[PDB]
CSV table of C-alpha atoms in Angstrom, one decimal:
chain,number,residue,atom,x,y,z
A,213,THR,CA,45.5,-147.8,142.8
A,214,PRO,CA,48.2,-146.7,140.4
A,215,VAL,CA,47.6,-143.2,139.0
A,216,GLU,CA,51.0,-142.4,137.5
A,217,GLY,CA,50.2,-140.0,134.6
A,218,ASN,CA,46.7,-141.4,134.3
A,219,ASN,CA,44.2,-138.6,134.8
A,220,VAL,CA,40.6,-139.8,135.6
A,221,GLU,CA,42.4,-142.0,138.1
A,222,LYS,CA,44.5,-139.3,139.7
A,223,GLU,CA,41.7,-136.9,140.4
A,224,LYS,CA,39.2,-139.8,141.0
A,225,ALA,CA,41.3,-141.1,143.8
A,226,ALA,CA,41.7,-137.6,145.1
A,227,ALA,CA,37.9,-137.1,145.3
A,228,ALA,CA,37.5,-140.4,147.1
A,229,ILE,CA,40.1,-139.3,149.6
A,230,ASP,CA,38.3,-135.9,150.2
A,231,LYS,CA,35.1,-137.7,150.9
A,232,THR,CA,37.0,-139.9,153.4
A,233,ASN,CA,38.3,-136.8,155.1
A,234,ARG,CA,34.8,-135.3,155.6
A,235,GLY,CA,33.5,-138.7,156.8
A,236,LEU,CA,36.2,-139.1,159.4
A,237,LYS,CA,35.5,-135.7,160.7
A,238,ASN,CA,31.8,-136.5,161.2
A,239,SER,CA,32.6,-139.9,162.8
A,240,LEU,CA,34.9,-138.2,165.3
A,241,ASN,CA,32.2,-135.8,166.3
A,242,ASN,CA,29.7,-138.6,166.7
A,243,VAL,CA,31.9,-140.7,169.0
A,244,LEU,CA,32.7,-137.6,171.0
A,245,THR,CA,29.0,-137.1,171.6
A,246,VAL,CA,28.7,-140.6,172.9
A,247,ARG,CA,31.7,-140.0,175.2
A,248,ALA,CA,30.0,-137.0,176.6
A,249,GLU,CA,26.8,-138.8,177.3
A,250,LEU,CA,28.7,-141.5,179.2
A,251,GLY,CA,30.5,-138.9,181.2
A,252,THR,CA,27.2,-137.5,182.4
A,253,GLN,CA,26.1,-141.1,183.2
A,254,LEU,CA,29.1,-141.6,185.4
A,255,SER,CA,28.7,-138.3,187.2
A,256,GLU,CA,25.1,-139.1,187.9
A,257,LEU,CA,26.0,-142.6,189.2
A,258,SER,CA,28.6,-141.2,191.6
A,259,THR,CA,26.2,-138.5,192.9
A,260,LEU,CA,23.3,-141.0,193.3
A,261,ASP,CA,25.2,-143.6,195.3
A,262,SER,CA,26.3,-141.0,197.9
A,263,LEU,CA,22.7,-139.9,198.2
A,264,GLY,CA,21.7,-143.6,198.8
A,265,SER,CA,24.3,-144.1,201.5
B,150,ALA,CA,42.9,-129.5,157.5
B,151,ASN,CA,39.9,-129.6,155.2
B,152,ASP,CA,38.8,-130.1,151.6
B,153,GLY,CA,40.1,-127.5,149.1
B,154,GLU,CA,42.5,-125.8,151.5
B,155,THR,CA,45.1,-126.4,148.9
B,156,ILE,CA,47.7,-124.8,146.6
B,157,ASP,CA,48.3,-125.7,143.0
B,158,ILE,CA,51.5,-125.8,141.0
B,159,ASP,CA,51.5,-125.8,137.2
B,160,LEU,CA,54.3,-127.5,135.2
B,161,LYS,CA,55.2,-127.4,131.5
B,162,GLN,CA,56.9,-129.6,129.0
B,163,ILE,CA,60.1,-127.7,128.2
B,164,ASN,CA,62.5,-128.9,125.4
B,165,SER,CA,63.6,-128.0,122.0
B,166,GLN,CA,60.3,-128.9,120.5
B,167,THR,CA,57.9,-127.0,122.8
B,168,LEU,CA,60.3,-124.0,122.5
B,169,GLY,CA,60.1,-124.2,118.7
B,170,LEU,CA,63.9,-124.4,118.3
B,171,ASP,CA,64.4,-127.9,116.8
B,172,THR,CA,64.8,-126.4,113.3
B,173,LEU,CA,67.4,-124.0,114.5
B,174,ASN,CA,70.2,-124.1,111.9
B,175,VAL,CA,72.8,-121.6,110.6
B,176,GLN,CA,74.2,-123.7,107.8
B,177,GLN,CA,74.2,-122.4,104.3
B,178,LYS,CA,73.6,-124.8,101.5
B,179,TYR,CA,76.6,-126.6,100.2
B,180,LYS,CA,76.9,-127.4,96.5
B,181,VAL,CA,76.6,-131.0,95.5
B,182,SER,CA,78.2,-132.8,92.5
B,183,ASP,CA,79.1,-136.4,91.9
B,184,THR,CA,81.4,-138.6,89.8
B,185,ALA,CA,81.2,-142.2,88.5
B,186,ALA,CA,83.2,-144.5,90.8
B,187,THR,CA,83.4,-147.5,88.6
B,188,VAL,CA,84.5,-150.4,90.9
B,189,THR,CA,85.8,-153.4,89.0
B,190,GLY,CA,86.1,-156.2,91.4
B,191,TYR,CA,84.8,-159.6,92.6
B,192,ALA,CA,83.6,-161.4,95.7
B,193,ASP,CA,82.2,-164.8,96.4
B,194,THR,CA,78.6,-165.8,97.3
B,195,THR,CA,77.4,-168.8,99.3
B,196,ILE,CA,75.7,-170.3,96.2
B,197,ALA,CA,77.6,-173.4,95.4
B,198,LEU,CA,79.3,-174.6,92.2
C,51,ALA,CA,54.1,-98.4,163.3
C,52,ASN,CA,52.2,-100.2,160.5
C,53,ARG,CA,51.8,-97.0,158.6
C,54,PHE,CA,55.5,-96.2,159.0
C,55,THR,CA,56.3,-99.7,157.7
C,56,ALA,CA,54.1,-99.1,154.6
C,57,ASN,CA,55.8,-95.8,154.0
C,58,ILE,CA,59.3,-97.3,154.3
C,59,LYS,CA,58.6,-100.1,151.9
C,60,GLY,CA,57.1,-97.7,149.4
C,61,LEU,CA,60.0,-95.2,149.6
C,62,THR,CA,62.6,-97.9,149.2
C,63,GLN,CA,60.9,-99.1,146.0
C,64,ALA,CA,60.6,-95.5,144.8
C,65,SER,CA,64.3,-94.9,145.2
C,66,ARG,CA,65.0,-97.9,143.0
C,67,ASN,CA,62.5,-96.5,140.5
C,68,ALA,CA,64.5,-93.3,140.4
C,69,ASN,CA,67.6,-95.3,139.7
C,70,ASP,CA,65.8,-96.7,136.6
C,71,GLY,CA,65.1,-93.2,135.5
C,72,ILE,CA,68.8,-92.2,135.8
C,73,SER,CA,69.8,-95.3,133.7
C,74,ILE,CA,67.4,-94.6,130.9
C,75,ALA,CA,68.5,-90.9,130.7
C,76,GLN,CA,72.1,-92.0,130.5
C,77,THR,CA,71.4,-94.4,127.6
C,78,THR,CA,69.7,-91.7,125.7
C,79,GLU,CA,72.5,-89.2,126.3
C,80,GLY,CA,75.1,-91.6,125.0
C,81,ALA,CA,73.2,-92.2,121.8
C,82,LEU,CA,72.9,-88.4,121.4
C,83,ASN,CA,76.7,-88.0,121.8
C,84,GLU,CA,77.4,-90.4,118.9
C,85,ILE,CA,74.9,-88.4,116.8
C,86,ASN,CA,76.7,-85.2,117.7
C,87,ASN,CA,80.0,-86.5,116.6
C,88,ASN,CA,78.6,-87.5,113.2
C,89,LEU,CA,77.0,-84.0,112.8
C,90,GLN,CA,80.4,-82.4,113.5
C,91,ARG,CA,82.0,-84.4,110.8
C,92,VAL,CA,79.2,-83.5,108.4
C,93,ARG,CA,79.7,-79.8,109.0
C,94,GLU,CA,83.5,-80.2,108.4
C,95,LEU,CA,82.8,-81.9,105.1
C,96,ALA,CA,80.2,-79.2,104.2
C,97,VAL,CA,82.9,-76.6,104.7
C,98,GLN,CA,85.3,-78.5,102.5
C,99,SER,CA,82.6,-78.8,99.7
C,100,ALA,CA,82.2,-75.1,98.9
C,101,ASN,CA,85.7,-74.6,97.4
C,102,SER,CA,85.0,-73.9,93.7
C,103,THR,CA,88.4,-75.5,92.8
C,104,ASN,CA,86.8,-79.0,92.7
C,105,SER,CA,85.0,-81.0,90.1
C,106,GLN,CA,81.9,-83.2,90.2
C,107,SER,CA,83.9,-86.4,91.0
C,108,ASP,CA,85.3,-84.8,94.2
C,109,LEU,CA,81.9,-83.6,95.2
C,110,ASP,CA,80.6,-87.1,94.6
C,111,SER,CA,83.2,-88.6,97.0
C,112,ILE,CA,82.2,-85.9,99.6
C,113,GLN,CA,78.6,-86.7,99.1
C,114,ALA,CA,79.4,-90.4,99.6
C,115,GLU,CA,80.8,-89.8,103.0
C,116,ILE,CA,77.9,-87.4,103.8
C,117,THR,CA,75.4,-90.0,102.9
C,118,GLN,CA,77.2,-92.7,105.0
C,119,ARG,CA,77.1,-90.4,108.0
C,120,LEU,CA,73.4,-89.7,107.6
C,121,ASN,CA,72.7,-93.4,107.2
C,122,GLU,CA,74.6,-94.0,110.4
C,123,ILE,CA,72.5,-91.4,112.2
C,124,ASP,CA,69.3,-93.1,110.9
C,125,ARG,CA,70.6,-96.5,112.1
C,126,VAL,CA,71.5,-95.2,115.6
C,127,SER,CA,68.1,-93.6,115.9
C,128,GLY,CA,66.4,-96.8,114.8
C,129,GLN,CA,68.3,-99.4,116.7
C,130,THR,CA,69.1,-97.8,120.1
C,131,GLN,CA,66.7,-99.2,122.8
C,132,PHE,CA,66.4,-99.6,126.5
C,133,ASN,CA,64.4,-102.5,127.9
C,134,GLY,CA,62.3,-102.3,124.7
C,135,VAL,CA,61.7,-98.6,124.8
C,136,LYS,CA,63.0,-97.0,121.6
C,137,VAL,CA,64.2,-93.8,123.2
C,138,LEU,CA,64.9,-91.9,120.0
C,139,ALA,CA,62.4,-93.4,117.5
C,140,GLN,CA,59.3,-91.5,118.6
C,141,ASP,CA,58.0,-88.7,120.7
C,142,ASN,CA,57.1,-90.1,124.1
C,143,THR,CA,56.5,-89.2,127.7
C,144,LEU,CA,57.7,-91.4,130.7
C,145,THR,CA,56.6,-91.1,134.3
C,146,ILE,CA,58.8,-92.3,137.1
C,147,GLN,CA,57.1,-93.0,140.4
C,148,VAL,CA,59.6,-91.4,142.9
C,149,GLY,CA,57.0,-91.0,145.7
D,199,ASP,CA,26.3,-146.3,102.8
D,200,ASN,CA,26.3,-148.7,99.8
D,201,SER,CA,22.6,-148.4,98.9
D,202,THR,CA,23.2,-145.5,96.6
D,203,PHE,CA,26.0,-147.5,94.9
D,204,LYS,CA,23.6,-150.3,94.1
D,205,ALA,CA,21.5,-148.0,92.0
D,206,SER,CA,24.7,-147.0,90.2
D,207,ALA,CA,25.3,-150.7,89.8
D,208,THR,CA,22.2,-150.8,87.6
D,209,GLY,CA,24.2,-148.4,85.4
D,210,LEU,CA,27.0,-150.9,85.2
D,211,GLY,CA,24.8,-153.9,84.6
D,212,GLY,CA,25.7,-157.5,85.0
D,213,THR,CA,24.2,-160.3,87.0
D,214,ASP,CA,25.2,-158.7,90.3
D,215,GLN,CA,27.5,-155.9,91.6
D,216,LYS,CA,29.1,-155.2,94.9
D,217,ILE,CA,31.8,-153.0,96.5
D,218,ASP,CA,34.9,-154.6,98.1
D,219,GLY,CA,36.8,-153.2,101.0
D,220,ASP,CA,36.6,-150.0,102.9
D,221,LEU,CA,36.7,-146.6,101.1
D,222,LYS,CA,40.1,-144.9,100.6
D,223,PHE,CA,40.1,-141.1,101.3
D,224,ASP,CA,42.1,-138.4,99.6
D,225,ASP,CA,43.7,-136.2,102.2
D,226,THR,CA,45.1,-133.8,99.6
D,227,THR,CA,42.2,-133.5,97.0
D,228,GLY,CA,39.2,-134.5,99.1
D,229,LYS,CA,38.0,-137.8,97.5
D,230,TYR,CA,36.8,-141.3,98.3
D,231,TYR,CA,37.6,-144.4,96.3
D,232,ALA,CA,36.3,-148.0,96.1
D,233,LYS,CA,36.7,-151.3,94.4
D,234,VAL,CA,33.8,-153.1,92.7
D,235,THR,CA,33.2,-156.8,91.7
D,236,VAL,CA,30.6,-157.8,89.3
D,237,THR,CA,28.9,-161.2,88.8
D,238,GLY,CA,29.0,-162.7,85.3
D,239,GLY,CA,29.9,-159.4,83.7
D,240,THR,CA,32.9,-158.2,81.9
D,241,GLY,CA,34.7,-154.9,82.2
D,242,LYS,CA,32.6,-153.8,85.2
D,243,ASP,CA,34.8,-155.1,87.9
D,244,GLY,CA,37.0,-152.1,88.7
D,245,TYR,CA,38.5,-149.5,91.0
D,246,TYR,CA,36.3,-146.4,91.1
D,247,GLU,CA,36.3,-142.9,92.4
D,248,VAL,CA,33.2,-141.9,94.4
D,249,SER,CA,31.5,-138.9,96.0
D,250,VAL,CA,29.7,-138.7,99.3
D,251,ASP,CA,27.5,-136.4,101.3
D,252,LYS,CA,28.3,-136.0,105.0
D,253,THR,CA,24.7,-136.3,106.4
D,254,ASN,CA,24.4,-140.0,105.4
D,255,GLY,CA,27.7,-141.1,103.8
D,256,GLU,CA,25.8,-142.5,100.8
D,257,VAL,CA,28.3,-143.4,98.2
D,258,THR,CA,27.9,-142.6,94.5
D,259,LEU,CA,30.4,-143.7,91.8
D,260,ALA,CA,31.5,-140.9,89.5
D,261,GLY,CA,34.0,-143.4,88.1
D,262,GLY,CA,31.0,-145.6,87.2
D,263,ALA,CA,32.1,-145.5,83.6
D,264,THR,CA,33.1,-149.0,82.4
D,265,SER,CA,36.8,-148.7,83.0
D,266,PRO,CA,39.0,-149.1,86.2
D,267,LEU,CA,40.9,-146.1,87.4
D,268,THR,CA,44.3,-145.7,85.9
D,269,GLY,CA,46.7,-148.0,87.8
D,270,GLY,CA,44.0,-149.3,90.1
D,271,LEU,CA,44.2,-146.5,92.7
D,272,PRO,CA,45.8,-143.1,92.8
D,273,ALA,CA,48.5,-142.5,95.4
D,274,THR,CA,46.6,-139.4,96.7
D,275,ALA,CA,44.2,-141.7,98.6
D,276,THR,CA,46.0,-144.5,100.5
D,277,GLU,CA,44.1,-144.3,103.8
D,278,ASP,CA,41.1,-146.5,104.2
D,279,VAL,CA,38.0,-145.5,106.2
D,280,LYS,CA,34.4,-146.7,106.8
D,281,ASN,CA,33.1,-143.3,108.0
D,282,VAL,CA,32.6,-139.7,106.8
D,283,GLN,CA,35.7,-137.6,106.5
D,284,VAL,CA,35.7,-133.9,107.0
D,285,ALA,CA,38.2,-131.1,106.3
D,286,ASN,CA,39.7,-129.0,109.1
D,287,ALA,CA,38.4,-125.8,107.6
D,288,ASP,CA,34.9,-127.1,108.0
D,289,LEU,CA,35.0,-127.1,111.8
D,290,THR,CA,31.5,-128.6,111.8
D,291,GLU,CA,31.4,-129.9,115.4
D,292,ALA,CA,33.2,-126.9,116.9
D,293,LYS,CA,30.8,-124.5,115.1
D,294,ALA,CA,27.8,-126.6,116.2
D,295,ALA,CA,29.1,-126.5,119.8
D,296,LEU,CA,29.5,-122.7,119.5
D,297,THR,CA,26.0,-122.4,118.2
D,298,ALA,CA,25.0,-124.5,121.3
D,299,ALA,CA,26.8,-121.7,123.3
D,300,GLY,CA,24.3,-119.3,121.8
D,301,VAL,CA,26.8,-117.6,119.4
D,302,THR,CA,24.7,-115.6,117.0
D,303,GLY,CA,27.4,-115.1,114.3
D,304,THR,CA,29.2,-116.7,111.5
D,305,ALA,CA,32.5,-118.0,112.9
D,306,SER,CA,36.0,-117.4,111.4
D,307,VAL,CA,39.2,-119.1,112.7
D,308,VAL,CA,42.5,-117.3,112.7
D,309,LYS,CA,46.0,-117.1,114.1
D,310,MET,CA,47.1,-114.4,116.5
D,311,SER,CA,49.7,-111.8,117.1
D,312,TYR,CA,50.1,-109.1,119.7
D,313,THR,CA,52.1,-105.8,120.0
D,314,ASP,CA,53.3,-103.6,122.8
D,315,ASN,CA,53.3,-99.8,122.9
D,316,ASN,CA,56.8,-99.8,121.6
D,317,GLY,CA,55.9,-101.7,118.4
D,318,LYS,CA,57.5,-105.0,119.5
D,319,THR,CA,55.4,-107.8,118.1
D,320,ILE,CA,54.9,-111.4,119.4
D,321,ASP,CA,52.9,-114.3,118.2
D,322,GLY,CA,49.9,-116.2,119.6
D,323,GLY,CA,47.8,-119.3,119.2
D,324,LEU,CA,44.6,-120.1,117.4
D,325,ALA,CA,41.2,-118.4,117.8
D,326,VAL,CA,37.6,-118.5,116.9
D,327,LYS,CA,36.7,-115.0,115.7
D,328,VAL,CA,33.2,-113.7,115.3
D,329,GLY,CA,33.3,-110.4,113.4
D,330,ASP,CA,35.1,-108.0,115.7
D,331,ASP,CA,35.0,-110.4,118.7
D,332,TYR,CA,37.4,-113.1,119.6
D,333,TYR,CA,37.4,-116.6,121.1
D,334,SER,CA,40.4,-118.8,121.8
D,335,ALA,CA,40.8,-122.3,120.3
D,336,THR,CA,43.0,-125.4,120.6
D,337,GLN,CA,44.0,-128.0,118.0
D,338,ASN,CA,43.1,-131.7,118.3
D,339,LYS,CA,44.7,-134.9,117.1
D,340,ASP,CA,44.5,-134.1,113.4
D,341,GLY,CA,43.9,-130.3,112.9
D,342,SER,CA,40.2,-130.5,114.0
D,343,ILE,CA,39.7,-127.7,116.5
D,344,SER,CA,38.4,-127.1,119.9
D,345,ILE,CA,37.4,-123.9,121.7
D,346,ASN,CA,39.1,-123.4,125.0
D,347,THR,CA,36.7,-124.2,127.8
E,100,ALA,CA,54.2,-97.2,138.1
E,101,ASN,CA,57.6,-97.2,136.4
E,102,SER,CA,57.2,-96.1,132.8
E,103,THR,CA,60.4,-98.1,132.2
E,104,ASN,CA,58.6,-101.4,132.8
E,105,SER,CA,58.0,-103.3,129.6
E,106,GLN,CA,54.6,-105.0,129.3
E,107,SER,CA,55.9,-108.5,130.0
E,108,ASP,CA,57.3,-107.2,133.3
E,109,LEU,CA,54.0,-105.7,134.1
E,110,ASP,CA,52.4,-109.1,133.5
E,111,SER,CA,54.9,-110.7,135.9
E,112,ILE,CA,54.0,-108.1,138.5
E,113,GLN,CA,50.3,-108.9,137.9
E,114,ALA,CA,51.0,-112.6,138.5
E,115,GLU,CA,52.6,-111.9,141.9
E,116,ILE,CA,49.7,-109.6,142.9
E,117,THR,CA,47.2,-112.3,141.9
E,118,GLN,CA,48.9,-114.9,144.0
E,119,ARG,CA,48.9,-112.5,147.0
E,120,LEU,CA,45.2,-112.0,146.6
E,121,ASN,CA,44.6,-115.7,146.3
E,122,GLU,CA,46.4,-116.2,149.7
E,123,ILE,CA,44.3,-113.4,151.2
E,124,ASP,CA,41.0,-115.2,150.2
E,125,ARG,CA,42.5,-118.4,151.5
E,126,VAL,CA,43.2,-116.8,154.9
E,127,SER,CA,39.7,-115.3,155.0
E,128,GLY,CA,37.8,-118.5,154.2
E,129,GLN,CA,39.8,-121.2,155.7
E,130,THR,CA,40.7,-120.0,159.2
E,131,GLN,CA,38.7,-121.7,162.0
E,132,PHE,CA,38.4,-122.1,165.7
E,133,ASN,CA,36.9,-125.1,167.4
E,134,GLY,CA,35.5,-126.0,164.0
E,135,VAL,CA,33.6,-122.7,163.3
E,136,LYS,CA,35.0,-120.2,160.8
E,137,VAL,CA,35.7,-116.7,162.0
E,138,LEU,CA,36.2,-114.2,159.2
E,139,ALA,CA,34.0,-115.6,156.3
E,140,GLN,CA,31.5,-112.9,157.2
E,141,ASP,CA,30.8,-109.8,159.2
E,142,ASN,CA,30.0,-111.3,162.6
E,143,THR,CA,28.8,-110.3,166.0
E,144,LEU,CA,29.4,-112.2,169.2
E,145,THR,CA,28.7,-111.8,173.0
E,146,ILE,CA,30.8,-113.5,175.6
E,147,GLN,CA,29.2,-114.0,179.1
E,148,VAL,CA,31.8,-112.6,181.6
E,149,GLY,CA,29.6,-112.1,184.6
């Protein structure tokens, strides 16, 4: 969006970008939580199969 | 890395007008007189004869 | 070490402040010297004036130069200034932070 | 508004009366102007000088006398407007906004100057001044004023 | 503290001081570790070393 010299577009775009920044941060934390849960799943599976053998 | 962790720079229009110097003039008034330059002479115009 | 650093910075700045004080004193003294010269001239003319051999025209010329000198004293007092401070125009007290 | 003119049209007479065009304002003497056309009449069609209140804009013809203004229209009012005009000294909306800010005082507007303890003087901007106390102000498109926010 | 300073110079000095203080508050608020802020309050923390 062109913002050259045009206030109400300059800052408006800037606010959208800020909201995007926060959103990306939250998304990263969420996907990291999912990764952690899968890591526990894998560790359990490895431990369980040895028990089975 | 986050919202508002920012620094601001202010900038100004600078020129003769915003500095209030456009009217800067040191000239004293000259005195003005005039004389009648009566030019007798002729020239042609596109209007036809 | 940090307290020493603080002291060192402060003392450096204070030295420069003292330099400012020296400068302003010198400006004031120079103005006073020009005033002194004018006063010397006025005393000379005053001596010349008392000779009863003269007539009012001569006294008028002498008074002319006297008045010019006094006007110059007034101008010097009025116009001399250092960084805005009008060192001779008014009674004033200046503190210099040398510590 | 024209409704107040139509009553003045009964003073002019004639079969019917109407005002033509927008109203021309006098930026140097504070006046409005208008043209009038009359139906079946004579010497009522004219250019007239009118007065207005700012609450409603209702137009009254002081020039209603049966004669056009000298030369049609004076040069002092060349700008045409459909809406209430107000003088810069009035500061109606700025004063109203101030009163919305809870200012309990008649407001005066001034130009500034400062001095230092050596008598050196400098100049400043515009201000809204309430007795002893000071507010800062900024100037709009045409001399109408704002208070710095 | 120089009595020689003219008031405009004092205003300049005040500008510089204000900018320093702005940076100080920036440091206070905005520093972080692992996502948590450290100095935006008086804080108390135990680490388990045994």
